[PDB]
Write a protein that binds this ligand. Structure first.
Ligand SMILES: CC(C)(O)Cn1c(NC(=O)c2cc(F)cc(-c3cccnc3)c2)nc2ccccc21
Length: 291
């Protein structure tokens, strides 16, 4: 493996200012805040993530390790960490919150252009993790954040690894045998897409997670969302193949979704599409990538 020359920056508690709480409870306490580097006329909006136990501090730092090691437009940036009694991860602020909440809150204002663009950006983001040899192991709409309606990024690398669990997003080989590859993340990409195309429905709603393993063994999959054409739904079903090597790679998903994003009303049928605003088989070179 190659040496990891990432800088982990250590920030002073004095350098930043907490303004209000965005999220709370189990996964942590996420605060809205502003960061002002010591000797620069610059104010950077940020999200700060904080009881102190030895086990808790290992896992929060392992997240910090990975987040510091990534640089992509569609992957979350760790700015630094502050070593107070409880450790704080200073990260880039994502004003519109998680995408799952965003789609549900704006069901009636999300056009097909946006949906397919998010599919490309997520696929792009995941493909970078594949390039960096990282498996995410928890891809969903709750762990994709919205910088702007035109710009989303992947997050939550507490479950990420090199080369309570969400059974309803996991591939079969992961559920049965604990085997996670990049192609097991493709399964979860498929579900994530399905969440967006259903405008934030719960996958396998009113089905307990212990039944899922046997359900998928029998051949059953998530149903085709109403807005989805057969073209888009086919791509989801390809992500949910029993054979993992049969599923598509993220580089190919980027291609297919970018293809569709050129002519969005052909591949998605939304009521009153492209009268709504928010705050030739051709692929542009930048969406054609080699590993
Ligand atoms: C629950 C959630 C995500 O909606 C909180 N939230 C956020 N989140 C972040 O800014 C944020 C940014 C990151 F770079 C990483 C994580 C992050 C998330 C999970 C685990 N680890 C790290 C969270 N922005 C908001 C704006 C409005 C309302 C709620 C908001």
């Amino acid at each position: 493996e190659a040496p990891n020359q990432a800088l982990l920056r250590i920030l002073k508690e004095t350098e930043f200012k907490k303004i209000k709480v965005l999220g709370s409870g189990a996964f942590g306490t996420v605060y809205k805040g502003l960061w002002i580097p010591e000797g620069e006329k610059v104010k950077i909006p940020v999200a700060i993530k904080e009881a102190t136990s030895p086990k808790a501090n290992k896992e929060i730092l392992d997240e910090a390790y990975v987040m510091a090691s990534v640089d992509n437009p569609h992957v979350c940036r760790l700015l630094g960490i502050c070593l107070t009694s409880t450790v704080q991860l200073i990260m880039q602020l994502m004003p519109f919150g998680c995408l799952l909440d965003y789609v549900r809150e704006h069901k009636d204002n999300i056009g097909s252009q946006y949906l397919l663009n998010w599919c490309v950006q997520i696929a792009k983001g995941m493909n970078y993790l594949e390039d960096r040899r990282l498996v995410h192991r928890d891809l969903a709409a709750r762990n994709v954040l919205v910088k702007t309606p035109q710009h989303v990024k992947i997050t939550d690398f507490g479950r990420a690894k090199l080369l309570k669990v969400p059974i309803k997003w996991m591939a079969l080989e992961s559920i049965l045998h604990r085997i996670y590859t990049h192609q097991s993340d493709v399964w979860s990409y498929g579900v994530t897409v399905w969440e967006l195309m259903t405008f934030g429905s719960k996958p396998y709603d009113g089905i307990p997670a212990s039944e899922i393993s046997s359900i998928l063994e029998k051949g059953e999959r998530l149903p085709q969302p109403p807005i989805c054409t057969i073209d888009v739904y086919m791509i989801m079903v390809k992500c949910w193949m029993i054979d993992a090597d049969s599923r598509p790679k993220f580089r190919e998903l980027i291609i297919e979704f970018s293809k569709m994003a050129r002519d969005p009303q052909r591949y998605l049928v939304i009521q009153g599409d492209e009268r709504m605003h928010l705050p030739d088989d051709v692929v542009d070179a930048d969406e054609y990538l080699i590993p």
